[PDB]
């Protein structure tokens, strides 16, 4: 309903609105799967109204009453998602053993780095997908020089780090 997008008529003009603590993760875990789905929308509805009220406050150049309310709802909403995700993660691992919901693998880019490549579903297979074959997952021979530079760069960073520590040590003696 339209009224749900707005605060209680009595609360209008109040400096703050009395609200309690946000939902904790354990309490949401105690709640049932169906309850969690129901709660998310209930949490969301308040968030939209608070967001709805906040935008009107921005239009009016006015403060939002009890801004902590929005943070509490977001904390409750965020806690719900992890609990739901945790249950999904546990079942996924048991039935399939996969630690990631989406298929993926470690692949080497043209720069010689090793990065996790998330597989994409396509209507056609890779071998008949010329564009996918056109995509480059191989490192050129010249990247060996870059790899040596990367190792040298890491060593340089450590050397600079020691220099940074040395200057800090000087002032410690000066200060104390």
């Amino acid at each position: 309903g339209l009224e749900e997008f707005f605060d209680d008529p009595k609360n209008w003009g109040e400096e703050k609105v009395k609200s309690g603590a946000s939902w904790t993760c354990q309490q949401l875990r105690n709640k049932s799967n169906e309850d969690l789905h129901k709660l998310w929308y209930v949490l969301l509805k308040e968030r939209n109204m608070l967001l709805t009220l906040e935008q009107e406050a921005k239009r009016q150049r006015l403060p939002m009453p009890s801004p902590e309310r929005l943070e509490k709802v977001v904390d409750s909403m965020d806690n719900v998602d992890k609990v739901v995700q945790e249950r999904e993660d546990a079942l996924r691992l048991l039935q399939t053993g996969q630690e990631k919901p989406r298929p993926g693998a470690w692949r080497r880019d043209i720069f010689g780095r090793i990065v996790w490549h998330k597989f994409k579903q396509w209507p056609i297979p890779w071998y008949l997908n010329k564009r996918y074959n056109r995509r480059r997952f191989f490192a050129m021979p010249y990247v060996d020089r870059f790899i040596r530079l990367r190792i040298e760069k890491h060593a340089r960073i450590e050397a600079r780090k020691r220099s940074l520590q040395k200057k800090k040590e000087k002032i410690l003696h000066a200060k104390f």
Partner: protein, 198 residues
Amino acid sequence: YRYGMSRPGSIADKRKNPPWSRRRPVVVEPISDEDWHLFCGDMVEILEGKDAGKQGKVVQVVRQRNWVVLEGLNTHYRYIGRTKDHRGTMIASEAPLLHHQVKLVDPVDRKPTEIQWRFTEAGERVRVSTRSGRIIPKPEFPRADGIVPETWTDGPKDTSVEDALERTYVPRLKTLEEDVMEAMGIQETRRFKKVYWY
């Protein structure tokens, strides 16, 4: 960035540490979490300062500067309410105390006794005085919002106490999405065709 009495990110802090400021940094002796023994609400005796020798309760701790703030102690005087119409009213303004400038107080005997950190049967770390060994319990501090949990009265949109504590989850081999389907009876018989992931 030099940490000050002003909270980081505040208007005073921004003036204290503007983006272009490159002042000679102040060095603070690092203190480990185990090493640190001063917490808000702890009764401590000021070793040195304006109010040296006066025991006070901590109200703010800037661990970055090893600063402990005691309300109504180490106090200099400033004017509140200075305006065109009125000169202003003098008030008490506290100054930070470094960690070495205070020491913990043994409850039974009020003295600045050096303390050593040791665990208890429950496993909670508790400070123990090096001499006249005794347990200094962690002090009780009111909630920052000022809300006493039990005294709090539920307002609009607030779940009652029992509702939050109720447990309805039943361990089963079904996700939230699957469980929602059973309760609301969502059924889908269509099937995606073979998809080549890559």
